[PDB]
Amino acid sequence: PSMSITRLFPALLECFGIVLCGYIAGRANVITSTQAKGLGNFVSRFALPALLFKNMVVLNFSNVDWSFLYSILIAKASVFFIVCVLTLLVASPDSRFSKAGLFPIFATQSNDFALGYPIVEALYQTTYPEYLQYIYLVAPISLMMLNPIGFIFCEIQKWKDTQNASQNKIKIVGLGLLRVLQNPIVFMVFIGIAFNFILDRKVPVYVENFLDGLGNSFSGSALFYLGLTMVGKIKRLKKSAFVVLILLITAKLLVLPLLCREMVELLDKGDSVVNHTSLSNYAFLYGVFPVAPGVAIFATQFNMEVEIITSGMVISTFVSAPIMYVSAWLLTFPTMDPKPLAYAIQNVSFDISIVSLISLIWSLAILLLSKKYKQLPHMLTTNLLIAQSIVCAGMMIWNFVKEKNFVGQILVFVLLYSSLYSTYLWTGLLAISLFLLKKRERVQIPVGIIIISGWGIPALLVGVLLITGKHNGDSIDSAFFYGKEQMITTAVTLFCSILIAGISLMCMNDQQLTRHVLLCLLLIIGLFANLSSCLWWLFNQEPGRLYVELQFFCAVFNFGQGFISFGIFGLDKHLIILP
Amino acid sequence: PSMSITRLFPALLECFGIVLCGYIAGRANVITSTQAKGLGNFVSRFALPALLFKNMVVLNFSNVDWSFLYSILIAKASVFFIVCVLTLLVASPDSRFSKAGLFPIFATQSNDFALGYPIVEALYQTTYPEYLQYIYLVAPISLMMLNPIGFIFCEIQKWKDTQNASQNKIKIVGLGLLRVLQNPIVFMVFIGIAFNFILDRKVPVYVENFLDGLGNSFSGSALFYLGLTMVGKIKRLKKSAFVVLILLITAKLLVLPLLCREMVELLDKGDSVVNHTSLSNYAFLYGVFPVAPGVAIFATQFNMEVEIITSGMVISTFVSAPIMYVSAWLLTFPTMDPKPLAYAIQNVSFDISIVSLISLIWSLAILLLSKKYKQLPHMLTTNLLIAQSIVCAGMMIWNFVKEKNFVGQILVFVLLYSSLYSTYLWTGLLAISLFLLKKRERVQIPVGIIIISGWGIPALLVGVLLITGKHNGDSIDSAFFYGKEQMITTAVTLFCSILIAGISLMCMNDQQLTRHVLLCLLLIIGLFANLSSCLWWLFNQEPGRLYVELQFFCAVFNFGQGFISFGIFGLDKHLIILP
């Protein structure tokens, strides 16, 4: 169709693989914090300028859909205004200016050159190569339009901090615009357009290889440097500052994507239907871009909200990969037939399993070698992780067994749904020990729950939906490998664990009890979607009211459970003694 | 034909422009020496491994001309053996093993991935893309074959330094091979061939973008890092160690290129004539590759001959650009008709003028702002540089005036040959003041020689060959813009300066008198070629005995004089106070 979603997963693997290489290099100490500066300087003062110059010089500027650009700039203006006003309305006067300045820059400025451009190039370079040029229009125009306002609030604050009796409103405003004009993304785009007109959009051949060679080294080096700078940045923040972060990231990864797409459809009236739709979806995906790291550099320069801005920028980077993936697949479902669409949910389930298995193997070795698994609640956690790991293996073979070897597909599906009910039940069991932690005097009982209930109940549930003989389901989805019975036993397996975890968590109100409630709290948001899908189907069989879409989110959660545990427990430092 | 020489100049501009960007960044202190380590680690442990892996995995290995590879490996074996034996025959016993170990590694190991591959890709990706794959065969096979021998000599030396009474010949040999096997160029090429067979030469699609993105960032980042590491490396070496360097660099930039080409023709009997010739010339250009910086890393690790190896590696890098350029153009002349061949010597003259002018403008500002120009012999030098600068302007317009505006071409040619005789005469005048420096009590006489002879004699000489009225020469070469008279006056202008400089230099036997004799000594090697060409022609008019080839070297020297002065006097540190 219009978007090459198939090419999206490898593009994400590239983008976030190189980021992870940089993170590992910085954690392994292969490159120290002082040494990472060299890579940053080369990418910011050489690789980036060359890329921007070259792309501005060739930009036709006579075939650019300014309406599409107008609608992205309008969406970002709207998010900037909302966040800034809300911050100025609830932030204490002392940090009101600093927060009203940086917050809306955080919520609108996105990682367009390093992360956005490879994803756009994968999705569009064959269908809509014209979409690529926008990256070099939107990002600098937005910097120019909106960053001066934020820097003006930050300078307004600096004045309060200095308590300077004098007043320099004009000077404050020139300090803001001057900070903007010294950004290479701005003055290099200026020089590049000047030479677009002088060189007549023709890069001098003699300098062409130099420009290509310097700009072709921007992407990998910048993604690697990104990884290096996310080392050690998430510091322990108060719940208040933790709510602020959730609100800030949501505005950039949710409100902006929705607004961008609504703006396009609102002011785009092109007479193609497929082209209006391709442009709307490109606007959504643009808005899903992660927060630019230059924002944390601004916060450092101004020395304001450094910890919250940097924590948020790192968290946003991590979180955008699942959201871009899932959003891009969801925007393609209206355009597919009911059969290629079930073959796509398997494609997606397979991709999530790939990355979830590697995340889980890492988190499992970390717990084992650290020996943290032999203490609670990490002992229960090390059980949920094992259950999640099994799933990712069964799914990656269920796609290789669906509609094949009905017999040998009774096991792969069984080892797929005992474990998967085990992960549903282990989520609930875990929130009990967290509650039992309050009753420390009361020694917990891992025995009888570690396996008797941990996997024994889940395993028995599969037998309940397996008693049927020769009931092998050619259904492309193991969820429908059986009749309503599978939906039933899955809807009630979910009901115990939904209430177990809920009541226990509320009743509950380095043991790491803070991160663990953060786990269960995220795992319950999943148990909500699957429970809804099972009952929703058990009400209107084969429902069409956004059900398949819900059937898709239940696949991402079922085989994405491990990746969640990874972000919580796989990056944690552990004393793993090989000897 | 077979080589795209036209595409060679832009490729060199890319390769050495990025190197110069890195050098400038390191001199301007944009990236410090500790910060440059980060870029090096990323390129060596990530960008390089990915590139090698990817290229080995896809290598067919069933369409590789092993005979061509055999002949390059044989030429390098031969140079390694010659240098090692000569070092073991003349080096004092104390450093004999260290020098016999590192010297032949220096003379054979070349900068194939960072510098070689873009040049090969420019010259060949359209005519012979099969030539590119060799870069990834020759370089690692050579590392494996020849580096263990050198590391064995270095370990043999370490033992003498430790004076360990015990003897571990086997252990010494395993230490050498172990050092070789830990080089990523070796074990990554191993892994890549293993997976060439396992993956059946098919890189997994899911990892393909990751591999391309990491390996596509190798070239620019590695050239930039190269530039950064050449900052401050040329230390003051004794004449002895200075002769050693000239011999070592000549073996790698001259003997190896000649041997490589002779080996190919010797053991290549393919039935195409154009293909045998294209392969011979590709072998020459391979051998002209600069010394790999990994060799200086070996010398650091072993802590042996660090200063000479690093100085030599930096000097070799600088020197290889003119040699690769000129060699590649010379290998194409047999294949061109007498008219496209005169239009090619103008092409070359134009390219050298481009880079010589920028080099001269830099060296001129450095002398002016430093105020060094107002002292001798820098005062005479600042005059020769000005004369060289004029030339580069007249040539870059002579190509735009040749066979055009006969009248307005009488000036461009005149301003081309007064200055050019001025550069010939200023070389001689300069070697006089260097001689006069010995007679310090004898105050020099810049007056009467600064302009009266510096440009007055040269200007009068042009009038001598200009007295002819309406003698405008449509000749594509300003050298033939006039009859034998131009060749005559040019042959005698050269004769004074050849003997002036010679007698004065011999009679002569921060004034910087060491670098200045190094200038005149190099400028006289040029005055030898032009003088020979003029007399050679004045003997056999329009001679065909390698004359045009000599006519080509006189063009490179005439418009390349500034670049020479740049490498001597443009990189020198100077106190330029703008205020």
Ligand SMILES: CC/C=C\C/C=C\C/C=C\C/C=C\C/C=C\C/C=C\CCC(=O)O[C@H](COC(=O)CCCCCCCCCCCCCCC)COP(=O)(O)OCCN
């Ligand atoms: C659900 C899965 C579904 C689909 C996925 C499918 C496809 C995705 C595509 C490609 C996969 C590639 C990579 C995945 C993402 C990032 C890895 C790269 C670098 C790690 C840097 C890091 O590790 O960066 C760290 C900062 O990220 C953190 O912490 C993590 C915080 C994240 C929140 C915690 C929950 C985990 C899951 C997140 C999803 C939540 C919402 C999802 C929406 C659907 C820096 O760690 P520190 O050293 O600062 O501290 C370290 C702790 N001590």
Ligand SMILES: CC/C=C\C/C=C\C/C=C\C/C=C\C/C=C\C/C=C\CCC(=O)O[C@H](COC(=O)CCCCCCCCCCCCCCC)COP(=O)(O)OCCN
């Ligand atoms: C002749 C011209 C003809 C044709 C040219 C045509 C095309 C060439 C193609 C592209 C041009 C691009 C770049 C030219 C080369 C290098 C520039 C890059 C980086 C500079 C690094 C540096 O600057 O690297 C320096 C180490 O190179 C040195 O010194 C320089 C020593 C070189 C020898 C001195 C003579 C100058 C000319 C060389 C030619 C000699 C033989 C030519 C054969 C034909 C490191 O300087 P340091 O800071 O260590 O010390 C600094 C001093 N205080």
Ligand SMILES: CCCCCCCC/C=C\CCCCCCCC(=O)O[C@H](COC(=O)CCCCCCCCCCCCCCC)COP(=O)([O-])OCC[N+](C)(C)C
């Ligand atoms: C004239 C107009 C042309 C168009 C505009 C050009 C735009 C090009 C755009 C992009 C091209 C590449 C730009 C990268 C460098 C400049 C941008 C920048 O801000 O970086 C600067 C480095 O700047 C440098 O160091 C200079 C390096 C340039 C060397 C060129 C080599 C030859 C290549 C030519 C190839 C072929 C040429 C053949 C000729 C025909 C960063 O330095 P800095 O940190 O800011 O300063 C120090 C500050 N502190 C930290 C010390 C305080």
Ligand SMILES: CCCCCCCC/C=C\CCCCCCCC(=O)O[C@H](COC(=O)CCCCCCCCCCCCCCC)COP(=O)([O-])OCC[N+](C)(C)C
């Ligand atoms: C299994 C076999 C496969 C084939 C072989 C692979 C070969 C690949 C070849 C090249 C690929 C890239 C190689 C670059 C790193 C490895 C080489 C190396 O020596 O570097 C090392 C870093 O190594 C790392 O840090 C690891 C980083 C890897 C992260 C991958 C991200 C996901 C991408 C997957 C994309 C999609 C995947 C989808 C899945 C379907 C350097 O570290 P070190 O300095 O030596 O150690 C520390 C030593 N001191 C200094 C501290 C003492």
Ligand SMILES: CCCCCCCC/C=C\CCCCCCCC(=O)O[C@H](COC(=O)CCCCCCCCCCCCCCC)COP(=O)(O)OCCN
């Ligand atoms: C879509 C349109 C959005 C409109 C309504 C969105 C709902 C959120 C609105 C307001 C919630 C803001 C307050 C949340 C909790 C803040 C707690 C708080 O008071 O901290 C204050 C933090 O408040 C701020 O600094 C600004 C608050 C966040 C600024 C941006 C607000 C988010 C706007 C975008 C949210 C959009 C998505 C939300 C729903 C999906 C700091 O001052 P202090 O507490 O007095 O001093 C102690 C230092 N922390």
Ligand SMILES: CCCCCCCC/C=C\CCCCCCCC(=O)O[C@H](COC(=O)CCCCCCCCCCCCCCC)COP(=O)(O)OCCN
């Ligand atoms: C979370 C687990 C279970 C929940 C299942 C849904 C999860 C959604 C998560 C967060 C809230 C995002 C929902 C956005 C709703 C906007 C839908 C919309 O209006 O798009 C309409 C149609 O949209 C489409 O074309 C396809 C639907 C997808 C749109 C949203 C796609 C991305 C949102 C999901 C990604 C968010 C987080 C995902 C990460 C796992 C536009 O037409 P309309 O006439 O204006 O409205 C039609 C409604 N009858």
Ligand SMILES: CCCCCCCC/C=C\CCCCCCCC(=O)O[C@H](COC(=O)CCCCCCCCCCCCCCC)COP(=O)(O)OCCN
């Ligand atoms: C064959 C096709 C793909 C195969 C698998 C691709 C993914 C492989 C990912 C990682 C493999 C290498 C991971 C560890 C290598 C080095 C570990 C290391 O030493 O750093 C350690 C820290 O490194 C880390 O923590 C890295 C954390 C993540 C590593 C593995 C993550 C799993 C991937 C999940 C993300 C999804 C992407 C999937 C990509 C396929 C030790 O640091 P420390 O504890 O602070 O103290 C310093 C002690 N040296």
Ligand SMILES: CCCCCCCC/C=C\CCCCCCCC(=O)O[C@H](COC(=O)CCCCCCCCCCCCCCC)COP(=O)(O)OCCN
């Ligand atoms: C093409 C086949 C080449 C064969 C003949 C090439 C002519 C060069 C042959 C021998 C010249 C070698 C000696 C030149 C000057 C060396 C002065 C010298 O004695 O220093 C000695 C330096 O000698 C060495 O270390 C090794 C000499 C250079 C090693 C490599 C020799 C170059 C071989 C390749 C040359 C090929 C091109 C030459 C002609 C274009 C050091 O020992 P020391 O002086 O006793 O202690 C004081 C510390 N320097």
Ligand SMILES: CCCCCCCC/C=C\CCCCCCCC(=O)O[C@H](COC(=O)CCCCCCCCCCCCCCC)COP(=O)(O)OCCN
């Ligand atoms: C230096 C200023 C004035 C001097 C003018 C010449 C400068 C040469 C510089 C250094 C010595 C390099 C000379 C290499 C001579 C090898 C020629 C050769 O054998 O190639 C023969 C033919 O060669 C050709 O096809 C074209 C000639 C070019 C070959 C050498 C090309 C590169 C050498 C020049 C580059 C060296 C430094 C240049 C940097 C400015 C092979 O056939 P043969 O039957 O074996 O011999 C035929 C002889 N009648």
Ligand SMILES: CCCCCCCC/C=C\CCCCCCCC(=O)O[C@H](COC(=O)CCCCCCCCCCCCCCC)COP(=O)(O)OCCN
């Ligand atoms: C428009 C098409 C091409 C236009 C021209 C392209 C070539 C432009 C080359 C260079 C322009 C920038 C050169 C200087 C920029 C910064 C100078 C600087 O501050 O670094 C200075 C050191 O930098 C240098 O020394 C660089 C030396 C070479 C610079 C220019 C070389 C001319 C090019 C000749 C090579 C041929 C390549 C030709 C490429 C077209 C100061 O360092 P310091 O004295 O040790 O003390 C530190 C005080 N800050």
Ligand SMILES: CC(C)CCC[C@@H](C)[C@H]1CC[C@H]2[C@@H]3CC=C4C[C@@H](O)CC[C@]4(C)[C@H]3CC[C@]12C
């Ligand atoms: C849903 C999309 C479209 C908008 C993004 C909202 C969600 C995905 C983002 C907004 C704030 C993010 C959270 C903020 C902070 C933390 C704590 C940190 O340790 C990682 C997990 C967690 C919990 C992040 C998970 C994802 C998160 C909740």
Ligand SMILES: CC(C)CCC[C@@H](C)[C@H]1CC[C@H]2[C@@H]3CC=C4C[C@@H](O)CC[C@]4(C)[C@H]3CC[C@]12C
């Ligand atoms: C001619 C080719 C094919 C072989 C290479 C030999 C020449 C070009 C190389 C070999 C050693 C080099 C010299 C060695 C050392 C110095 C001193 C240093 O300050 C730069 C100039 C100078 C003088 C270099 C100029 C070029 C050089 C003479």
Ligand SMILES: *[C@@H]1O[C@H](CO)[C@@H](O)[C@H](O)[C@H]1NC(C)=O
């Ligand atoms: C729709 O997009 C396609 C793809 O680039 C383009 O060729 C076509 O002109 C567009 N149609 C309209 C009506 O703009």
Ligand SMILES: *[C@@H]1O[C@H](CO)[C@@H](O)[C@H](O)[C@H]1NC(C)=O
């Ligand atoms: C000569 O080289 C060309 C260019 O690749 C190739 O197509 C041709 O097969 C070669 N000829 C012979 C006889 O090998």
Ligand code: NA
């Ligand atoms: Na980011």
Ligand code: NA
């Ligand atoms: Na080199």
